[PDB]
Amino acid sequence: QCLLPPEDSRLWQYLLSRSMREHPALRSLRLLTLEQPQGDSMMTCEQAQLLANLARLIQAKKALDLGTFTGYSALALALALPADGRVVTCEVDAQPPELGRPLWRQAEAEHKIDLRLKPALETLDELLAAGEAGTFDVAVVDADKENCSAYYERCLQLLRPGGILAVLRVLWRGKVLQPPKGDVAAECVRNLNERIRRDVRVYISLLPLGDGLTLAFKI
Amino acid sequence: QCLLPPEDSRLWQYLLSRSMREHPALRSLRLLTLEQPQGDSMMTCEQAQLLANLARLIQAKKALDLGTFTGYSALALALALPADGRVVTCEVDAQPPELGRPLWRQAEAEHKIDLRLKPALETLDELLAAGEAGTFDVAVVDADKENCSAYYERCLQLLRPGGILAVLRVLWRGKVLQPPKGDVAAECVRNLNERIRRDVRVYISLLPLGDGLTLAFKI
Numbered sequence: 101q102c103l104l105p106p107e108d109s110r111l112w113q114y115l116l117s118r119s120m121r122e123h124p125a126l127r128s129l130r131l132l133t134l135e136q137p138q139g140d141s142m143m144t145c146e147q148a149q150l151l152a153n154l155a156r157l158i159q160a161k162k163a164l165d166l167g168t169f170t171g172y173s174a175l176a177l178a179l180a181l182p183a184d185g186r187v188v189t190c191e192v193d194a195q196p197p198e199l200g201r202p203l204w205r206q207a208e209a210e211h212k213i214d215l216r217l218k219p220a221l222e223t224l225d226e227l228l229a230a231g232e233a234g235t236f237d238v239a240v241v242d243a244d245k246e247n248c249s250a251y252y253e254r255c256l257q258l259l260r261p262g263g264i265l266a267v268l269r270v271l272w273r274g275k276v277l278q279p280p281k282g283d284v285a286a287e288c289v290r291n292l293n294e295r296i297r298r299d300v301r302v303y304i305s306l307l308p309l310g311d312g313l314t315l316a317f318k319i
Numbered sequence: 320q321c322l323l324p325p326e327d328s329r330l331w332q333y334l335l336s337r338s339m340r341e342h343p344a345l346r347s348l349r350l351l352t353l354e355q356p357q358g359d360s361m362m363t364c365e366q367a368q369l370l371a372n373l374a375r376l377i378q379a380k381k382a383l384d385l386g387t388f389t390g391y392s393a394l395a396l397a398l399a400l401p402a403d404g405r406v407v408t409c410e411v412d413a414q415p416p417e418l419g420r421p422l423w424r425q426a427e428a429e430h431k432i433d434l435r436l437k438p439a440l441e442t443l444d445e446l447l448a449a450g451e452a453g454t455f456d457v458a459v460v461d462a463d464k465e466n467c468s469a470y471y472e473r474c475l476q477l478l479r480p481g482g483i484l485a486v487l488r489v490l491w492r493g494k495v496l497q498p499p500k501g502d503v504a505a506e507c508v509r510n511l512n513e514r515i516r517r518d519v520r521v522y523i524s525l526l527p528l529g530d531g532l533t534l535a536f537k538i
Protein backbone atom coordinates (compact mmCIF):
# COMPACT_ATOMS: atom_id res chain seq x y z
CA GLN A 101 0.00 0.00 0.00
CA CYS A 102 2.82 2.39 0.91
CA LEU A 103 6.51 2.38 -0.06
CA LEU A 104 7.67 4.51 2.89
CA PRO A 105 7.55 4.03 6.68
CA PRO A 106 5.17 5.89 9.05
CA GLU A 107 5.90 9.64 9.46
CA ASP A 108 7.18 8.94 13.01
CA SER A 109 10.07 6.81 11.69
CA ARG A 110 13.38 8.20 13.03
CA LEU A 111 15.09 7.76 9.64
CA TRP A 112 12.23 9.56 7.89
CA GLN A 113 12.44 12.37 10.49
CA TYR A 114 16.17 12.66 9.80
CA LEU A 115 15.41 12.94 6.04
CA LEU A 116 13.00 15.79 6.77
CA SER A 117 15.10 17.61 9.37
CA ARG A 118 18.26 17.52 7.19
CA SER A 119 16.46 18.77 4.06
CA MET A 120 13.36 20.88 4.83
CA ARG A 121 13.58 24.66 4.37
CA GLU A 122 9.88 25.43 4.68
CA HIS A 123 8.75 29.07 4.58
CA PRO A 124 7.00 29.97 7.91
CA ALA A 125 3.72 30.85 6.13
CA LEU A 126 3.88 27.58 4.16
CA ARG A 127 4.59 25.70 7.41
CA SER A 128 1.63 27.46 9.11
CA LEU A 129 -0.60 26.55 6.15
CA ARG A 130 0.41 22.88 6.34
CA LEU A 131 -0.30 22.57 10.07
CA LEU A 132 -3.73 24.24 9.64
CA THR A 133 -4.52 22.04 6.61
CA LEU A 134 -3.77 18.82 8.56
CA GLU A 135 -6.62 19.61 10.97
CA GLN A 136 -9.13 19.87 8.12
CA PRO A 137 -11.41 17.15 6.72
CA GLN A 138 -9.31 15.43 3.99
CA GLY A 139 -6.23 17.30 5.33
CA ASP A 140 -4.33 14.04 4.80
CA SER A 141 -4.85 14.43 1.03
CA MET A 142 -2.62 17.55 0.93
CA MET A 143 0.74 17.59 -0.88
CA THR A 144 3.48 16.60 1.57
CA CYS A 145 6.10 19.16 2.54
CA GLU A 146 9.03 17.36 0.88
CA GLN A 147 7.04 16.88 -2.36
CA ALA A 148 6.20 20.59 -2.44
CA GLN A 149 9.84 21.53 -1.78
CA LEU A 150 11.05 19.20 -4.54
CA LEU A 151 8.59 20.75 -7.02
CA ALA A 152 9.48 24.31 -5.89
CA ASN A 153 13.17 23.48 -6.22
CA LEU A 154 12.61 22.16 -9.78
CA ALA A 155 10.57 25.30 -10.65
CA ARG A 156 13.43 27.44 -9.34
CA LEU A 157 15.97 25.25 -11.19
CA ILE A 158 14.37 25.91 -14.59
CA GLN A 159 13.66 29.59 -13.73
CA ALA A 160 9.87 29.01 -14.02
CA LYS A 161 7.61 32.06 -14.35
CA LYS A 162 4.25 30.47 -15.24
CA ALA A 163 2.85 27.48 -13.30
CA LEU A 164 -0.42 25.57 -13.40
CA ASP A 165 -1.76 23.93 -10.25
CA LEU A 166 -4.79 21.60 -10.53
CA GLY A 167 -6.60 21.03 -7.22
CA THR A 168 -5.93 24.04 -5.03
CA PHE A 169 -7.38 22.63 -1.82
CA THR A 170 -6.03 25.09 0.82
CA GLY A 171 -3.33 26.36 -1.56
CA TYR A 172 -0.26 24.51 -0.21
CA SER A 173 1.17 23.50 -3.61
CA ALA A 174 0.06 26.84 -5.11
CA LEU A 175 1.99 28.73 -2.39
CA ALA A 176 5.05 26.45 -2.57
CA LEU A 177 5.21 27.15 -6.34
CA ALA A 178 4.49 30.88 -5.91
CA LEU A 179 7.49 31.25 -3.53
CA ALA A 180 9.77 29.60 -6.17
CA LEU A 181 8.77 32.17 -8.81
CA PRO A 182 10.18 35.70 -9.31
CA ALA A 183 8.10 38.82 -8.53
CA ASP A 184 6.33 38.69 -11.93
CA GLY A 185 5.65 34.94 -11.62
CA ARG A 186 2.09 33.60 -11.68
CA VAL A 187 0.47 30.34 -10.54
CA VAL A 188 -2.91 29.59 -12.11
CA THR A 189 -4.55 27.34 -9.48
CA CYS A 190 -7.83 25.43 -10.15
CA GLU A 191 -10.48 24.31 -7.62
CA VAL A 192 -14.22 23.62 -7.39
CA ASP A 193 -14.79 24.05 -3.64
CA ALA A 194 -14.57 27.74 -2.63
CA GLN A 195 -14.10 26.98 1.10
CA PRO A 196 -10.55 25.46 1.35
CA PRO A 197 -8.72 28.18 -0.69
CA GLU A 198 -10.27 30.81 1.60
CA LEU A 199 -8.62 28.98 4.57
CA GLY A 200 -5.20 29.33 2.88
CA ARG A 201 -5.58 32.86 1.48
CA PRO A 202 -4.51 34.59 4.76
CA LEU A 203 -1.23 32.62 4.58
CA TRP A 204 -0.75 33.41 0.89
CA ARG A 205 -1.02 37.06 2.04
CA GLN A 206 1.43 36.64 4.93
CA ALA A 207 3.96 35.19 2.47
CA GLU A 208 3.47 38.27 0.27
CA ALA A 209 2.54 35.87 -2.58
CA GLU A 210 -1.22 36.47 -2.90
CA HIS A 211 -0.72 38.59 -6.06
CA LYS A 212 1.15 35.69 -7.67
CA ILE A 213 -1.65 33.20 -7.09
CA ASP A 214 -4.46 33.26 -9.68
CA LEU A 215 -7.41 31.24 -8.31
CA ARG A 216 -9.85 29.89 -10.90
CA LEU A 217 -12.96 28.52 -9.18
CA LYS A 218 -14.34 26.26 -11.87
CA PRO A 219 -13.73 22.66 -13.00
CA ALA A 220 -10.08 22.26 -14.02
CA LEU A 221 -11.12 20.87 -17.42
CA GLU A 222 -12.87 24.19 -18.17
CA THR A 223 -9.81 26.25 -17.22
CA LEU A 224 -7.50 24.02 -19.24
CA ASP A 225 -9.70 24.29 -22.34
CA GLU A 226 -9.94 28.09 -21.95
CA LEU A 227 -6.16 28.46 -21.67
CA LEU A 228 -5.75 26.42 -24.84
CA ALA A 229 -8.51 28.21 -26.78
CA ALA A 230 -6.68 31.47 -25.87
CA GLY A 231 -3.63 30.12 -27.76
CA GLU A 232 -1.51 29.53 -24.61
CA ALA A 233 -0.15 26.14 -25.73
CA GLY A 234 3.59 25.83 -24.98
CA THR A 235 3.74 28.79 -22.53
CA PHE A 236 3.67 27.14 -19.04
CA ASP A 237 6.85 26.08 -17.21
CA VAL A 238 5.41 23.79 -14.53
CA ALA A 239 2.08 21.90 -14.24
CA VAL A 240 0.88 20.03 -11.13
CA VAL A 241 -1.95 17.50 -11.58
CA ASP A 242 -3.54 16.89 -8.16
CA ALA A 243 -7.30 17.30 -8.64
CA ASP A 244 -9.90 14.54 -9.11
CA LYS A 245 -8.73 11.19 -10.53
CA GLU A 246 -11.78 10.75 -12.80
CA ASN A 247 -10.49 13.42 -15.28
CA CYS A 248 -6.73 12.93 -14.71
CA SER A 249 -6.06 11.61 -18.28
CA ALA A 250 -7.71 14.66 -19.85
CA TYR A 251 -5.72 16.83 -17.40
CA TYR A 252 -2.44 15.18 -18.36
CA GLU A 253 -3.03 15.69 -22.10
CA ARG A 254 -4.04 19.35 -21.72
CA CYS A 255 -1.19 20.23 -19.28
CA LEU A 256 1.34 18.63 -21.66
CA GLN A 257 0.08 20.84 -24.49
CA LEU A 258 0.16 23.91 -22.21
CA LEU A 259 3.78 23.29 -21.19
CA ARG A 260 6.70 24.61 -23.22
CA PRO A 261 9.39 22.17 -24.36
CA GLY A 262 11.57 21.70 -21.24
CA GLY A 263 8.54 22.14 -18.97
CA ILE A 264 7.73 19.93 -15.96
CA LEU A 265 4.45 17.96 -15.56
CA ALA A 266 3.97 16.51 -12.06
CA VAL A 267 1.21 14.02 -11.31
CA LEU A 268 0.53 13.34 -7.63
CA ARG A 269 -0.86 10.27 -5.85
CA VAL A 270 -0.05 7.92 -8.74
CA LEU A 271 0.14 4.68 -6.68
CA TRP A 272 -3.32 5.17 -5.13
CA ARG A 273 -2.41 3.34 -1.89
CA GLY A 274 -1.29 0.30 -3.92
CA LYS A 275 -4.68 -0.08 -5.59
CA VAL A 276 -2.98 0.42 -8.96
CA LEU A 277 -1.65 -3.18 -8.53
CA GLN A 278 -5.19 -4.52 -8.95
CA PRO A 279 -7.87 -1.80 -9.05
CA PRO A 280 -11.01 -3.20 -7.34
CA LYS A 281 -13.87 -3.93 -9.76
CA GLY A 282 -15.95 -0.74 -10.27
CA ASP A 283 -13.32 1.47 -8.62
CA VAL A 284 -13.36 4.28 -11.19
CA ALA A 285 -10.65 6.38 -9.43
CA ALA A 286 -8.23 3.45 -9.19
CA GLU A 287 -8.82 2.41 -12.81
CA CYS A 288 -8.27 6.03 -13.84
CA VAL A 289 -4.94 6.26 -11.96
CA ARG A 290 -3.86 2.92 -13.45
CA ASN A 291 -4.87 3.94 -17.03
CA LEU A 292 -2.92 7.21 -16.84
CA ASN A 293 0.20 5.45 -15.53
CA GLU A 294 0.07 3.17 -18.57
CA ARG A 295 -0.34 6.10 -20.92
CA ILE A 296 2.59 8.03 -19.41
CA ARG A 297 4.69 4.81 -19.46
CA ARG A 298 4.29 4.70 -23.29
CA ASP A 299 4.49 8.44 -23.93
CA VAL A 300 7.42 9.33 -26.23
CA ARG A 301 6.66 13.08 -25.80
CA VAL A 302 8.19 13.04 -22.32
CA TYR A 303 10.99 11.42 -20.32
CA ILE A 304 9.85 10.33 -16.89
CA SER A 305 10.68 9.44 -13.27
CA LEU A 306 8.27 7.91 -10.78
CA LEU A 307 9.30 8.66 -7.16
CA PRO A 308 8.29 7.06 -3.80
CA LEU A 309 7.10 10.31 -2.17
CA GLY A 310 3.60 10.86 -0.73
CA ASP A 311 1.28 8.45 -2.57
CA GLY A 312 3.69 8.29 -5.52
CA LEU A 313 4.94 11.20 -7.63
CA THR A 314 5.41 11.20 -11.41
CA LEU A 315 7.69 13.79 -12.98
CA ALA A 316 7.24 13.98 -16.73
CA PHE A 317 9.67 16.27 -18.55
CA LYS A 318 8.43 17.62 -21.87
CA ILE A 319 10.64 17.18 -24.95
CA GLN B 320 18.21 1.09 8.09
CA CYS B 321 16.08 1.59 4.93
CA LEU B 322 13.22 3.82 3.98
CA LEU B 323 12.21 1.50 1.14
CA PRO B 324 11.04 -2.13 0.83
CA PRO B 325 13.18 -4.70 -1.07
CA GLU B 326 13.71 -4.10 -4.80
CA ASP B 327 11.71 -7.22 -5.71
CA SER B 328 8.57 -6.18 -3.80
CA ARG B 329 5.35 -5.85 -5.88
CA LEU B 330 4.70 -2.10 -5.49
CA TRP B 331 8.37 -1.25 -6.11
CA GLN B 332 8.39 -3.45 -9.24
CA TYR B 333 5.35 -1.46 -10.39
CA LEU B 334 7.13 1.85 -9.85
CA LEU B 335 10.10 0.57 -11.92
CA SER B 336 8.09 -0.99 -14.75
CA ARG B 337 5.92 2.14 -15.11
CA SER B 338 8.93 4.49 -15.28
CA MET B 339 12.14 2.78 -16.46
CA ARG B 340 13.49 3.48 -19.97
CA GLU B 341 17.09 2.29 -19.99
CA HIS B 342 18.85 2.33 -23.34
CA PRO B 343 19.52 -1.37 -24.22
CA ALA B 344 23.30 -0.91 -23.61
CA LEU B 345 22.60 0.69 -20.20
CA ARG B 346 20.30 -2.21 -19.30
CA SER B 347 22.98 -4.69 -20.43
CA LEU B 348 25.60 -2.86 -18.35
CA ARG B 349 23.34 -3.19 -15.25
CA LEU B 350 22.71 -6.89 -15.82
CA LEU B 351 26.41 -7.60 -16.45
CA THR B 352 27.45 -5.63 -13.34
CA LEU B 353 24.95 -7.63 -11.25
CA GLU B 354 26.73 -10.87 -12.27
CA GLN B 355 29.86 -9.58 -10.42
CA PRO B 356 30.86 -9.72 -6.72
CA GLN B 357 29.66 -6.42 -5.12
CA GLY B 358 27.74 -5.71 -8.36
CA ASP B 359 24.89 -4.22 -6.30
CA SER B 360 27.26 -1.38 -5.30
CA MET B 361 26.05 0.14 -8.59
CA MET B 362 23.46 2.87 -8.06
CA THR B 363 19.91 1.64 -8.65
CA CYS B 364 18.47 2.08 -12.16
CA GLU B 365 15.82 4.68 -11.12
CA GLN B 366 18.41 6.84 -9.37
CA ALA B 367 20.60 6.84 -12.50
CA GLN B 368 17.49 7.59 -14.57
CA LEU B 369 16.42 10.49 -12.35
CA LEU B 370 19.92 12.00 -12.62
CA ALA B 371 20.02 11.46 -16.44
CA ASN B 372 16.54 13.00 -16.72
CA LEU B 373 17.51 16.09 -14.72
CA ALA B 374 20.70 16.43 -16.86
CA ARG B 375 18.52 16.38 -19.99
CA LEU B 376 16.01 18.76 -18.40
CA ILE B 377 18.75 21.44 -17.90
CA GLN B 378 20.36 20.72 -21.33
CA ALA B 379 23.58 19.56 -19.62
CA LYS B 380 26.75 19.49 -21.78
CA LYS B 381 29.36 18.68 -19.06
CA ALA B 382 28.99 16.26 -16.18
CA LEU B 383 31.24 14.96 -13.43
CA ASP B 384 30.81 11.38 -12.22
CA LEU B 385 32.83 10.46 -9.11
CA GLY B 386 33.15 6.72 -8.55
CA THR B 387 32.97 5.17 -12.02
CA PHE B 388 32.77 1.53 -10.87
CA THR B 389 31.62 -0.33 -14.03
CA GLY B 390 30.49 2.97 -15.65
CA TYR B 391 26.74 2.71 -15.06
CA SER B 392 26.09 6.28 -13.82
CA ALA B 393 28.71 7.59 -16.34
CA LEU B 394 26.80 5.95 -19.21
CA ALA B 395 23.40 7.04 -17.87
CA LEU B 396 24.68 10.65 -17.84
CA ALA B 397 26.42 10.41 -21.26
CA LEU B 398 23.13 9.26 -22.86
CA ALA B 399 21.37 12.41 -21.57
CA LEU B 400 23.98 14.71 -23.24
CA PRO B 401 24.28 15.99 -26.85
CA ALA B 402 26.88 14.65 -29.28
CA ASP B 403 29.56 17.02 -28.02
CA GLY B 404 28.71 16.40 -24.36
CA ARG B 405 31.35 15.11 -21.97
CA VAL B 406 31.25 13.12 -18.73
CA VAL B 407 34.46 13.23 -16.68
CA THR B 408 34.27 9.98 -14.71
CA CYS B 409 36.76 9.31 -11.85
CA GLU B 410 37.89 5.96 -10.48
CA VAL B 411 40.93 4.41 -8.68
CA ASP B 412 40.21 0.74 -9.59
CA ALA B 413 41.14 0.03 -13.26
CA GLN B 414 39.22 -3.28 -13.47
CA PRO B 415 35.51 -2.39 -13.14
CA PRO B 416 35.59 0.30 -15.91
CA GLU B 417 37.03 -2.39 -18.25
CA LEU B 418 33.82 -4.34 -17.63
CA GLY B 419 31.57 -1.46 -18.69
CA ARG B 420 33.55 -0.05 -21.63
CA PRO B 421 32.03 -2.46 -24.24
CA LEU B 422 28.60 -1.14 -23.24
CA TRP B 423 29.86 2.46 -23.51
CA ARG B 424 30.88 1.50 -27.08
CA GLN B 425 27.53 -0.19 -27.82
CA ALA B 426 25.80 3.04 -26.72
CA GLU B 427 27.99 5.24 -29.02
CA ALA B 428 29.10 7.01 -25.83
CA GLU B 429 32.86 6.31 -25.65
CA HIS B 430 33.77 9.70 -27.10
CA LYS B 431 31.54 11.32 -24.45
CA ILE B 432 33.01 9.42 -21.49
CA ASP B 433 36.34 10.77 -20.25
CA LEU B 434 37.74 8.20 -17.81
CA ARG B 435 40.29 9.53 -15.26
CA LEU B 436 41.97 6.62 -13.52
CA LYS B 437 43.34 8.22 -10.32
CA PRO B 438 41.92 9.58 -7.03
CA ALA B 439 38.95 11.87 -7.72
CA LEU B 440 40.42 14.63 -5.54
CA GLU B 441 43.41 14.90 -7.89
CA THR B 442 41.16 15.14 -10.96
CA LEU B 443 38.96 17.77 -9.30
CA ASP B 444 42.01 19.92 -8.48
CA GLU B 445 43.28 19.57 -12.05
CA LEU B 446 39.95 20.73 -13.54
CA LEU B 447 39.89 23.74 -11.20
CA ALA B 448 43.56 24.57 -12.01
CA ALA B 449 42.60 24.34 -15.71
CA GLY B 450 40.04 27.15 -15.26
CA GLU B 451 36.92 24.96 -15.37
CA ALA B 452 35.19 26.48 -12.29
CA GLY B 453 31.53 27.34 -12.98
CA THR B 454 31.39 25.28 -16.23
CA PHE B 455 29.92 21.87 -15.22
CA ASP B 456 26.16 21.24 -15.35
CA VAL B 457 25.83 18.07 -13.21
CA ALA B 458 28.13 16.46 -10.62
CA VAL B 459 27.47 12.99 -9.10
CA VAL B 460 29.33 12.23 -5.84
CA ASP B 461 29.37 8.44 -5.46
CA ALA B 462 32.95 7.53 -4.56
CA ASP B 463 34.53 6.97 -1.13
CA LYS B 464 32.99 8.61 1.94
CA GLU B 465 36.37 9.60 3.47
CA ASN B 466 36.75 12.48 1.03
CA CYS B 467 33.05 13.29 0.40
CA SER B 468 33.25 16.76 2.01
CA ALA B 469 36.19 17.73 -0.20
CA TYR B 470 34.27 16.31 -3.23
CA TYR B 471 31.20 18.39 -2.35
CA GLU B 472 33.21 21.63 -2.15
CA ARG B 473 35.21 21.05 -5.36
CA CYS B 474 32.11 19.92 -7.29
CA LEU B 475 30.17 22.99 -6.10
CA GLN B 476 32.97 25.20 -7.39
CA LEU B 477 33.06 23.34 -10.71
CA LEU B 478 29.28 23.68 -11.20
CA ARG B 479 27.67 26.67 -12.89
CA PRO B 480 24.77 28.55 -11.28
CA GLY B 481 21.74 26.28 -11.84
CA GLY B 482 23.95 23.17 -11.85
CA ILE B 483 22.96 20.00 -9.99
CA LEU B 484 25.16 18.35 -7.33
CA ALA B 485 23.93 14.85 -6.46
CA VAL B 486 25.27 13.01 -3.41
CA LEU B 487 24.54 9.29 -3.23
CA ARG B 488 24.18 7.07 -0.14
CA VAL B 489 23.63 9.92 2.33
CA LEU B 490 21.74 7.82 4.92
CA TRP B 491 24.55 5.20 5.19
CA ARG B 492 22.15 2.35 6.07
CA GLY B 493 20.82 4.41 8.99
CA LYS B 494 24.23 4.85 10.64
CA VAL B 495 23.87 8.65 10.23
CA LEU B 496 21.41 8.48 13.16
CA GLN B 497 24.18 7.52 15.62
CA PRO B 498 27.52 6.70 13.90
CA PRO B 499 29.21 3.80 15.76
CA LYS B 500 32.53 4.49 17.52
CA GLY B 501 35.46 4.37 15.09
CA ASP B 502 33.08 4.38 12.11
CA VAL B 503 34.92 7.06 10.11
CA ALA B 504 32.77 6.73 6.95
CA ALA B 505 29.49 7.08 8.90
CA GLU B 506 30.90 10.19 10.63
CA CYS B 507 31.92 11.61 7.24
CA VAL B 508 28.38 11.07 5.85
CA ARG B 509 26.79 12.61 8.96
CA ASN B 510 29.11 15.65 8.84
CA LEU B 511 28.42 16.40 5.17
CA ASN B 512 24.65 16.20 5.74
CA GLU B 513 24.90 18.90 8.43
CA ARG B 514 26.95 21.14 6.10
CA ILE B 515 24.56 20.72 3.14
CA ARG B 516 21.52 21.27 5.44
CA ARG B 517 22.99 24.68 6.42
CA ASP B 518 24.45 25.55 3.03
CA VAL B 519 23.12 28.89 1.68
CA ARG B 520 24.89 28.36 -1.69
CA VAL B 521 22.33 25.72 -2.70
CA TYR B 522 18.66 24.75 -2.39
CA ILE B 523 18.19 21.08 -1.59
CA SER B 524 16.04 17.94 -1.62
CA LEU B 525 16.83 14.67 0.09
CA LEU B 526 14.98 11.76 -1.51
CA PRO B 527 14.26 8.23 -0.19
CA LEU B 528 15.88 6.44 -3.14
CA GLY B 529 18.58 3.80 -2.71
CA ASP B 530 20.50 4.62 0.48
CA GLY B 531 19.25 8.25 0.37
CA LEU B 532 19.91 10.74 -2.43
CA THR B 533 20.65 14.46 -1.92
CA LEU B 534 20.07 16.84 -4.80
CA ALA B 535 21.69 20.22 -4.23
CA PHE B 536 20.83 22.92 -6.81
CA LYS B 537 23.50 25.63 -7.10
CA ILE B 538 22.42 29.23 -6.73
Ligand SMILES: C[S@@+](CC[C@H](N)C(=O)[O-])C[C@H]1O[C@@H](n2cnc3c(N)ncnc32)[C@H](O)[C@@H]1O
Nearest residue numbers: 141142143167169172173191192219220243244
Ligand atom coordinates in the same frame (compact mmCIF):
# COMPACT_ATOMS: atom_id res chain seq x y z
C1 LIG C 1 -5.59 16.08 -3.17
S1 LIG C 1 -6.44 17.69 -3.09
C2 LIG C 1 -5.15 18.77 -3.76
C3 LIG C 1 -4.03 19.02 -2.75
C4 LIG C 1 -3.35 20.37 -2.89
N1 LIG C 1 -2.73 20.48 -4.24
C5 LIG C 1 -2.30 20.60 -1.80
O1 LIG C 1 -1.22 21.14 -2.07
O2 LIG C 1 -2.52 20.29 -0.64
C6 LIG C 1 -7.59 17.52 -4.47
C7 LIG C 1 -8.37 18.81 -4.75
O3 LIG C 1 -8.94 18.76 -6.04
C8 LIG C 1 -10.23 19.35 -5.94
N2 LIG C 1 -11.05 18.99 -7.12
C9 LIG C 1 -11.92 17.93 -7.28
N3 LIG C 1 -12.44 18.00 -8.53
C10 LIG C 1 -11.92 19.06 -9.17
C11 LIG C 1 -12.10 19.59 -10.45
N4 LIG C 1 -12.93 19.01 -11.33
N5 LIG C 1 -11.41 20.74 -10.80
C12 LIG C 1 -10.53 21.34 -9.90
N6 LIG C 1 -10.35 20.81 -8.64
C13 LIG C 1 -11.03 19.69 -8.29
C14 LIG C 1 -10.77 18.91 -4.59
O4 LIG C 1 -11.87 19.70 -4.16
C15 LIG C 1 -9.51 19.03 -3.74
O5 LIG C 1 -9.39 20.29 -3.07
Ligand SMILES: C[S@@+](CC[C@H](N)C(=O)[O-])C[C@H]1O[C@@H](n2cnc3c(N)ncnc32)[C@H](O)[C@@H]1O
Nearest residue numbers: 361362386388391392410411438439461462463
Ligand atom coordinates in the same frame (compact mmCIF):
# COMPACT_ATOMS: atom_id res chain seq x y z
C1 LIG D 1 29.36 2.99 -5.02
S1 LIG D 1 30.66 2.66 -6.25
C2 LIG D 1 30.13 3.83 -7.55
C3 LIG D 1 28.96 3.23 -8.33
C4 LIG D 1 28.68 3.94 -9.64
N1 LIG D 1 28.46 5.40 -9.37
C5 LIG D 1 27.43 3.33 -10.24
O1 LIG D 1 26.41 4.02 -10.33
O2 LIG D 1 27.41 2.18 -10.61
C6 LIG D 1 32.04 3.60 -5.54
C7 LIG D 1 33.27 3.69 -6.45
O3 LIG D 1 34.18 4.66 -5.95
C8 LIG D 1 35.47 4.18 -6.20
N2 LIG D 1 36.45 4.96 -5.41
C9 LIG D 1 36.92 4.72 -4.13
N3 LIG D 1 37.80 5.71 -3.82
C10 LIG D 1 37.91 6.56 -4.88
C11 LIG D 1 38.64 7.73 -5.11
N4 LIG D 1 39.47 8.21 -4.17
N5 LIG D 1 38.53 8.40 -6.33
C12 LIG D 1 37.68 7.90 -7.31
N6 LIG D 1 36.94 6.75 -7.08
C13 LIG D 1 37.05 6.09 -5.88
C14 LIG D 1 35.38 2.71 -5.86
O4 LIG D 1 36.50 2.03 -6.39
C15 LIG D 1 34.02 2.36 -6.46
O5 LIG D 1 34.16 1.86 -7.76
